[PDB]
Amino acid sequence: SSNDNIELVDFQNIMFYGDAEVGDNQQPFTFILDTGSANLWVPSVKCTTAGCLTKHLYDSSKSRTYEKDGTKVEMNYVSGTVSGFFSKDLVTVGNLSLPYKFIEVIDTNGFEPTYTASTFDGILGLGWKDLSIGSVDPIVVELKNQNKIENALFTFYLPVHDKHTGFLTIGGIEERFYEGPLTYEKLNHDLYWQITLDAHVGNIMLEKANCIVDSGTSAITVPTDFLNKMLQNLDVIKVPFLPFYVTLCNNSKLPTFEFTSENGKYTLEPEYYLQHIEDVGPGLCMLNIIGLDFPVPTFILGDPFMRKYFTVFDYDNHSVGIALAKKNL
Amino acid sequence: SSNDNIELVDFQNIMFYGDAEVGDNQQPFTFILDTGSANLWVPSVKCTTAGCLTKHLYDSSKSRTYEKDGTKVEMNYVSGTVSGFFSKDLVTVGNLSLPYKFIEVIDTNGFEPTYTASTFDGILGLGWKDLSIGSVDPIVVELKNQNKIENALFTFYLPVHDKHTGFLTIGGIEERFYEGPLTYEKLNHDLYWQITLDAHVGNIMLEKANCIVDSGTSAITVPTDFLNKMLQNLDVIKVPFLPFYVTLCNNSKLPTFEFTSENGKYTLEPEYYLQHIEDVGPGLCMLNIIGLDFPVPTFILGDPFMRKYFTVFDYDNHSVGIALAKKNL
Ligand SMILES: CC(C)CC(=O)N[C@H](C(=O)N[C@H](C(=O)N[C@H]([C@@H](O)CC(=O)N[C@@H](C)C(=O)N[C@H]([C@@H](O)CC(=O)O)C(F)(F)F)C(F)(F)F)C(C)C)C(C)C
Ligand SMILES: CC(C)CC(=O)N[C@H](C(=O)N[C@H](C(=O)N[C@H]([C@@H](O)CC(=O)N[C@@H](C)C(=O)N[C@H]([C@@H](O)CC(=O)O)C(F)(F)F)C(F)(F)F)C(C)C)C(C)C
């Protein structure tokens, strides 16, 4: 190697996390690393929520390179909201560093009960500037301007529970991570890491669908009506009030996602997308396919897809690369 | 009986619905009758959206009493968004009826998957005027200002699946529904049906807590910090990123909720917030409790609560009245 590797820890085969620093001193945080968004936020010390009370908090008066701003910003996701103000300081990943504009968080109730339940401290976006709030040029794009990295690109090799850890690599592609050919798909918009793919599952086919590839989503997301058509030939239990379903993890009538383009064929078997709930019953699983409508019919290939597919995110080449991940490092 | 009833139909143990009709012909619909909002809306015959396929729709043309208006609106719900424009025409509930301004919806896409998954057509608000978009007097206030019922008040007797249907009554109180004394709590505000009660659960006590009585909230809603302290040592399982809490139905460690004031004490014991999930696993139950945070600490006493307690909603005397519902009519 000769690149910047940031190690990834598994949560349960559902999420993954990875650490970075802020400020010139230590000040360590646990992050959701998120191609899904394009802001960095961090829990402040001025924060008196029940939530922050369990987290590693951030101290702006104990870092020599702080730089006040205090502009109020509401940061919203599909899963919730988070509030506070802007600030600037030295963000440090792997062993690379830069001055950066990030968000200091004072309200977290919009993201509960998930925040207090989970081990992460904050969320480090990895999208494009048009997706950012307050036009912040992505870290990786800036580490190229400061000729700190070879390429304006980053790479995701995700951990599997009883096999290996994973890495986020900045600057270049490493062969150790994948086996087989990489396939590059072009972005249809410089917003989300979004590419165009025929999605089909048994008979249900959706040609030329928007596909956002998102490190900070624990499910596969599916147009709301698409899920209904799929549900029609399954035999799963509905969870009374919620849009969630339960199956045996060995139900053979479970579908494989097939996404195809001019360049590649990527499939996602049940054994990657199911969410194991051993502690509720033996061999019992959440379907972990979620109904979610956008303006455009859209599929979020999230964590489960990324557990099987090693992926390259290329700013220079406006593209996403996709290959089979190595079963073992 | 002296006042008008509307029969309440049990929606698969989950929700309940009632029928009201719109226009000078009948044109019936199925509404969620809902103390937590204060607009009436009904899907248009002019509707373009997929959701509307399975629904009763409203035809201006077929009704003499229609009155053009057409100001664009957007109704917003913790659970989604629904869009259209206003119209005035003849709302009828049971068989009291009045010219009433309401929303003709034409886009339901922000209301999925709930709208296609459920079998209601509209929502009928029963909260207060300030809750409404466009400053609309509640139906039951107008019905009274126009002298069609004795008191500006409505009552709720929820169905129980295996046992009885339910009734929304308008204008009077009916002895046949409750048992023992009514007790009345002034609202703390004329917005939601919101009173102040002391919430006590384990050794966790929240004092002077805002409580919303919401016949359209399928669960009981607790502050996220309170609910997180609450689960703590009970043998419950929060499924990692879901509001999905599972236990043994006999978990003899499960607390009774206890709300109190000068006048009364309201308990809701495990048998009231537990939904049987036999199909998932033998002897298993889920806790019908959400963790939600408003700007001020709040509880929402939704359907679970109202399944135990007959509730009286009095605009005249600005209060909620609570007495134990009859086991069987
Ligand atoms: C999927 C559930 C069954 C389990 C669960 O809830 N998992 C959560 C989840 O995956 N949530 C996803 C999510 O919000 N991910 C988040 C992002 O990766 C995507 C994002 O929302 N990005 C923001 C920037 C977004 O698009 N927000 C938009 C707008 O603010 C922006 C706009 O429209 O331009 C939104 F708020 F949804 F409206 C994460 F990671 F939380 F930060 C969701 C299913 C997409 C995780 C604990 C986070
Ligand atoms: C959450 C699980 C229990 C499953 C679930 O989805 N349950 C549903 C439910 O209870 N949803 C609740 C809800 O949205 N109830 C709804 C109302 O009772 C309250 C309301 O949203 N009121 C509005 C008026 C409100 O507070 N809006 C505000 C503002 O926009 C103010 C504004 O402009 O009106 C909000 F959207 F929250 F932001 C119902 F019925 F859909 F109408 C939710 C748990 C709070 C039902 C099975 C359909």
Give residue A12's identity as a one-letter amino acid code. Answer: Q
Out of A11, A228, A242, closest to residue B244 by CB: A242
Q: Beta-carbon neighbour count of residue A231 at 10 Å?
A: 16
Q: Report angle CA A68, A72, A75 to the nearest 5 degrees.
A: 115
> Which residues are registered as beta bridge partners of A190?
A193
Class of domain A176-329: mainly beta
Q: Is A235 exposed, middle or buried (0-12, 13-18, 19+ CB in 10 A)?
A: exposed
Q: Test B50 with A225 for CB contact under 8 angstroms.
A: yes
Report which DSSP code applies to A68.
-
Separation of first and last alpha carbons in chain B: 14
Q: Residue B278 and residue B263: Cα distance in Å, rounded?
A: 39
Separation of first and last alpha carbons in chain A: 14
Cα A82 off chain centre by: 17
**Which residue in A86, A81, A8 sits closest to A41, CA to CA?**
A86
Query: Which residues lie closer than 8 Å to B61 by C-beta, 6 or more apart?
Result: B45
Q: Which ligand is nearest to the CA of B34?
A: 2
CA dihedral in degrees (A106, A110, A114, A116; nearest 10)? Answer: 30
**Which residue in B19, B281, B42, B297 sits closest to B168, CA to CA?**
B19
- Residue A268 belongs to what H/E stretch? strand A265-268
Q: Residue A243 and residue A6: Cα distance in Å, rounded?
A: 35
Q: Test B241 with A112 for CB contact under 8 angstroms.
A: no
Residue A77 CA to ligand 1 centre (angstroms) = 4
Q: Beta-carbon neighbour count of residue B76 at 10 Å?
A: 13
Residue B277 CA to ligand 1 centre (angstroms) = 29
Q: Residue A182 and residue B44: Cα distance in Å, rounded?
A: 50
Residue A320 has phi, psi (to 5 degrees) of -125, 130
Q: Residue B224 and residue A51: Cα distance in Å, rounded?
A: 9
Domain range summary for chain A, segments of one domain joined by +: 1-175, 176-329
Q: Residue A324 and residue A305: Cα distance in Å, rounded?
A: 10
Shortest CA gap A142–chain B (Å): 33
Q: Residue A38 and residue A34: Cα distance in Å, rounded?
A: 8
A vs B: CB pairs below 8 A: 90
| DSSP letter for each residue of A99-165 | EEEEEEEEE-GGGTTHHHHSS--EEEE-S-TTTSSS----HHHHHHHTT-SSSSEEEEE--BTTTB-
Sheet holding A237-238, edge to edge: A237-238, A245-248, A284-286, A275-276
Out of B109, B116, B238, closest to residue A117 by CB: B238
Give the number of C-alpha atoms closer than 13 A to the C-alpha of residue B132, restricted to the C-beta side.
21
Best of A79, A115, A119, A280 to disrupt the B interface (most B CBs within 10 Å) is A280
Tokens of A243: 């849009």
Q: Do domains B1-175 and B176-329 have the same CATH topology?
A: yes
| DSSP letter for each residue of A5-42 | EEEEEEETTTEEEEEEEESSS--EEEEEEETT---BEE
Q: In terms of DSSP bridges, do strands A298-301 and A204-213 run parallel, antiparallel, or are they unpaired?
A: parallel
- Give one word for B303, left, alpha or beta, with left for phi > 0 and alpha for psi -120 to 50: alpha
What is the CATH topology of the domain spanning A1-175? Cathepsin D, subunit A; domain 1 (2.40.70)
Residue A198 CA to ligand 1 centre (angstroms) = 23
How many helices (DSSP H) and strands (DSSP E) are in chain A?
5, 24
Q: Residue B39 and residue B81: Cα distance in Å, rounded?
A: 13
Q: In terms of DSSP bridges, do strands A220-222 and A237-238 run parallel, antiparallel, or are they unpaired?
A: unpaired
Q: Is A110 exposed, middle or buried (0-12, 13-18, 19+ CB in 10 A)?
A: middle
> A244 to chain B: which residues are within 8 Å by CB?
242, 244
Q: Is A294 exposed, middle or buried (0-12, 13-18, 19+ CB in 10 A)?
A: middle
Report which DSSP code applies to A260.
E
Q: Test B281 with A280 for CB contact under 8 angstroms.
A: yes
Q: Report helix, strand or coil for B228.
A: helix
Q: Residue B252 and residue B215: Cα distance in Å, rounded?
A: 29
Shortest CA gap A85–chain B (Å): 18
Whether B34 sits among the annotated catalytic residues: the reply is yes
> Which residues are registered as beta bridge partners of A160?
A164
Shortest CA gap B159–chain A (Å): 17
